[PDB]
Design a protein around this ligand. Sequence first.
Ligand SMILES: O=P(O)(O)OC[C@H]1O[C@](O)(COP(=O)(O)O)[C@@H](O)[C@@H]1O
Ligand SMILES: O=P(O)(O)OC[C@H]1O[C@](O)(COP(=O)(O)O)[C@@H](O)[C@@H]1O
Ligand SMILES: O=P(O)(O)OC[C@H]1O[C@](O)(COP(=O)(O)O)[C@@H](O)[C@@H]1O
Ligand SMILES: O=P(O)(O)OC[C@H]1O[C@](O)(COP(=O)(O)O)[C@@H](O)[C@@H]1O
Ligand SMILES: O=P(O)(O)OC[C@H]1O[C@](O)(COP(=O)(O)O)[C@@H](O)[C@@H]1O
Lengths: 250, 250, 252, 250, 250
Amino acid sequence: NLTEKFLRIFARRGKSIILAYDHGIEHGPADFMDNPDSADPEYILRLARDAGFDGVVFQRGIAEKYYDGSVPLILKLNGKTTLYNGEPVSVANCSVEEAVSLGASAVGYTIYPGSGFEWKMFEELARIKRDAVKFDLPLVVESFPRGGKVVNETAPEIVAYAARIALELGADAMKIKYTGDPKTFSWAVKVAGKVPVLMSGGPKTKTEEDFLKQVEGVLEAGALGIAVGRNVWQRRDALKFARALAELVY
Amino acid sequence: NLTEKFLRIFARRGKSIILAYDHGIEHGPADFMDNPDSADPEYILRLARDAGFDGVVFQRGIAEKYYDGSVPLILKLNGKTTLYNGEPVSVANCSVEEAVSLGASAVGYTIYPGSGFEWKMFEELARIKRDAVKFDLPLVVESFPRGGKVVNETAPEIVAYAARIALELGADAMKIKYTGDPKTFSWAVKVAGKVPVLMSGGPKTKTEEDFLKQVEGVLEAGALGIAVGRNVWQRRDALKFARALAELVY
Amino acid sequence: NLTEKFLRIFARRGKSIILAYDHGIEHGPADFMDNPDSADPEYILRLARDAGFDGVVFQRGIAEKYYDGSVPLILKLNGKTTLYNGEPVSVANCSVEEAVSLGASAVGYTIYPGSGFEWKMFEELARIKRDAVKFDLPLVVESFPRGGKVVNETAPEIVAYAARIALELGADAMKIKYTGDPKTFSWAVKVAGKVPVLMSGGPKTKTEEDFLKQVEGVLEAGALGIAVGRNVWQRRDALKFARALAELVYGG
Amino acid sequence: NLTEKFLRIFARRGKSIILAYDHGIEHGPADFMDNPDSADPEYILRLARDAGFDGVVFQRGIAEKYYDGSVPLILKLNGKTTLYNGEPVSVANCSVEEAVSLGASAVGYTIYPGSGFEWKMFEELARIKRDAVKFDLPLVVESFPRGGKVVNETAPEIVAYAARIALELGADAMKIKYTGDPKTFSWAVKVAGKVPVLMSGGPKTKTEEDFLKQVEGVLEAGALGIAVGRNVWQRRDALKFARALAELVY
Amino acid sequence: NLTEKFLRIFARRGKSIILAYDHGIEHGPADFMDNPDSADPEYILRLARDAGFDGVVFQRGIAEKYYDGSVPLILKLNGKTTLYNGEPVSVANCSVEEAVSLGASAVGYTIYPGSGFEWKMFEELARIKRDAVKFDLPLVVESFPRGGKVVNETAPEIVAYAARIALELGADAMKIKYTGDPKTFSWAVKVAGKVPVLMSGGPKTKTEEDFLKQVEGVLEAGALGIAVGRNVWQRRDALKFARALAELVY
Ligand SMILES: O=P(O)(O)OC[C@H]1O[C@](O)(COP(=O)(O)O)[C@@H](O)[C@@H]1O
Ligand SMILES: O=P(O)(O)OC[C@H]1O[C@](O)(COP(=O)(O)O)[C@@H](O)[C@@H]1O
Ligand SMILES: O=P(O)(O)OC[C@H]1O[C@](O)(COP(=O)(O)O)[C@@H](O)[C@@H]1O
Ligand SMILES: O=P(O)(O)OC[C@H]1O[C@](O)(COP(=O)(O)O)[C@@H](O)[C@@H]1O
Ligand SMILES: O=P(O)(O)OC[C@H]1O[C@](O)(COP(=O)(O)O)[C@@H](O)[C@@H]1O
């Protein structure tokens, strides 16, 4: 049971905080100027370790060049840029077998349900899922409906659809966007069933309290925890705030 | 003979009711708000068991996390969302071999004849059919003309075309839409030849009586039975109505 | 020499009549209302037998469920619908290896030269041709230019192009449309060289005599014979007319 | 060294004349009405032998049904039609291994630099080139820029680009179009470097003298020779003119 | 550690100059008319040797026909032409295995982040990266965002995105365009982290001083050095200028 394995590795305390760091490809390094140390993957690993978080999410190149075994790794297999204007699509740049060799304890794969290319990602996820089972690495589906009929990605029905799709396609754990309130988020959590839900952190909030309040809602909705990037490492007090997040979640 | 095997497993009483539950990907969880228990796959299994139905249709994720061997399983191999706006296409997210490992007694695969991508589904079905024969699992082709010249999915000529294509491509059983009357539906059944036809249930009807009359017409037309989802589990009296369906069909 | 194998199996009397029955996918069952028995593949087999024809053309599903070994089988490997609106394309739904298992004595594959997807069918045909040689099953290329610049599928130069393409791509036999006259059709036959030509029957003609006159033209032009569906099984007098075609084609 | 091999087989006299006969797919048989015997590949092989040319170029179907070993064969692996209206593309209908079995001493492959599908042919050529090396068959790249920014195919800078691309991608010999004069064409020859150049003959010229003057210019520019089709076999005095072309070139 | 291998071979003096010569396919031989000896790959090798540069970059055809082992080789695996009008895409015409057989010490692969075909290149690069690791050949990613939302290829934020993408995808070294000043260029170098950065030389500059100026800034920003083509071999004083560069960089 790969969900059970995911939880042993990434949620030993019963809840999970994963420090997300695939932004260098997904958004580019403009994200890193607020807190320039955030451009340095070594700083990110130290941060996750020092705050006592459960894991980090890296693309293959960051993992190859920097990963040192100090915190469990989720290897994000696919990746696209914001320079791309087409129907949303993100193809694997790394295989599950290579992820195993790079030290990963789980793999991550983004899908964009609704995209004109939704079929391309579903076709590839089939192969990645089969390999995840073969290599006994839990599969985290990052389910982000985008393109087609999707307008507001945080709409209650879109986030619930994202969660269900991830369960239906074989996710062992999933990452989805927060709806902005625990009632509607709890329905997303419900339709995910036996598969645990991590809230994607989102753009840096106006205040630290605003983010803390979102996290409180995520936990009240019954989610497993958070996959947070910017709301930690875009801050000059990243470690201080990370430790506050740890106190709340754990 | 995989048709004979399908009938032995799914039509032991001479007619068949399959409880369809791929809706979580195809339509999303808005289908589940009417009767919220329907979001829970365990409730669906209990429903199929308690109503005395012949099988359930699950996507791979639901099968992996929830399937318990209590009712024969049809593993629906492909899937798409309603968020998608292009020419209709649904690609496999699971292989026949993996379906066997998940406890399937048959596999399902949706095609959209007429679609600008009709070719992509015919190419893949070729590989699925070959694997179905190799693994001795019946193939249920869900034949739903859509896109292209199709403007009325329940027109007599369209449903008969759906049926015949399914036969031509190697289906061992098939699921098609009802034309709304037994005379025109009997022609679709005729052109399907030796391959048994299941009626797709469709949106929830205004009355239970309306659905029962459709089912009566399907049976008068010589179909094997129904693959029904919403018209059972979207009702708050799901089990009561399921038993009335069992009474009529068997 | 797979052309020689094709002729031995499908043209023992020196000319060939093949009963075509892929219509259930290509056109759908509206083709079958005129003579409802035509929807029953068992009727189609009895008809080919009783009329003394050389073969039948089936898609894989009809071959699997109905083929009984009684008349040689050409397994039509690809197939598309008329519901489709794109640039014409027909992809394989069956392999040559599976065709062998289904009792096929040859395989058929449609190409649409000129189509925006011309390349997709030529690419697949390459694999099917290699497999035909490996399994020693003759390949019948059904060459029907359509899409692109094609405005008249029975124009003399379009049919001759169709024929030449089939030869060039490795057909062991071919099926092409009739031009409507023996002089222009004999040029198509000529450019096909050593590869035998079968005339595709086409829509049911207004009279039986119109069809027999086309077939007469086809034979004068030096074609091997005909691959006919609707002009036989859309007729309520299917067997009577089929036997008339047998005497014209085999009798000379 | 497959260039040396090519030259040993197809240029033993130091110069080459190859009789091209892929026209039946590329242009269709309207090419053959001027001299109807030209539709008969047996006639074409006799012509090449009787004129003492170095080779013939056939598609797989003509090679299989007609090739008799009497003149060295270049198996043209791809082919498209003039009925086609899209971005120029020509895919392989034959493998290198099959070419060997059909008795080829070299393989030919057409590319259309600039085409919207340029990538499809480069992708394929990569595989063909690799196989050519494995089977020790020289690769003749037929380089014809078309589509994209290409307006005039016989412009000096386009013919030179054609020649250079062939060298860069691994051609052991190449075929390109004539620019119409020896000075500009000699620059194409130069940029081709160690890879010999064959002039593609083109449409039947108005007079036999016109073509002879072209071939002279070709030889003046330092090309290896010609790959000619129409300007020989579209002429009712094919053999007599072919012998004049042999006297000139050799 | 293939970065270290790259540096040992191509940066033994601590900085690097690579002579780039993939122009024959990328731009065509119009690039060669200024200095017609530049069309001769033997000349290019001589230049690299006599100026004491660290490598050359060749396409497979040039490597096969001309590479003599005299200067370390980067085998540029993909290639496109300027005749092409679609969304930018460059597919491999050579495998890593073949590059090893051709005598390569590293391989190069161009990506165009932002292109409608971004996914196609990312998919292919994944295979190339896996092979590079397998054959122990450093992978140089040439990261040139183009198409999509890219308006200005030398914009500070674009070049830095280019650098980060290369790191994330698994480059052992990278080649990017210069921003035109050292301050913004040092941000690109920083976000590249442990992966060394080579500046692409660009169009032949108006004066020799202008190019040196660019190079002075590139080194100031902390780049490893330059991959220069035109600004050396397009000059009629090529060898001299090349030796003035060698003086500056080393
Ligand atoms: O739609 P977005 O904002 O790009 O979200 C996707 C990004 O958010 C994450 O899931 C979590 O990071 P953040 O907390 O910074 O949002 C990243 O892994 C991913 O790249
Ligand atoms: O694509 P549509 O038209 O929504 O219908 C397809 C759906 O119908 C079914 O065949 C049967 O379910 P329903 O009885 O609820 O219609 C499902 O398996 C499938 O998802
Ligand atoms: O262009 P059309 O009319 O679809 O013709 C194609 C059909 O004709 C045939 O070649 C022969 O059948 P018909 O004699 O009915 O025309 C079939 O095998 C094929 O499906
Ligand atoms: O651009 P075109 O006219 O189609 O030229 C391509 C044709 O020319 C050739 O290279 C040589 O034949 P020709 O001498 O008749 O031009 C053929 O092999 C090829 O099919
Ligand atoms: O795609 P562009 O902008 O034409 O430039 C890329 C070219 O520049 C290089 O990276 C370096 O060569 P140059 O110094 O002449 O620019 C070449 O390898 C590459 O072909």
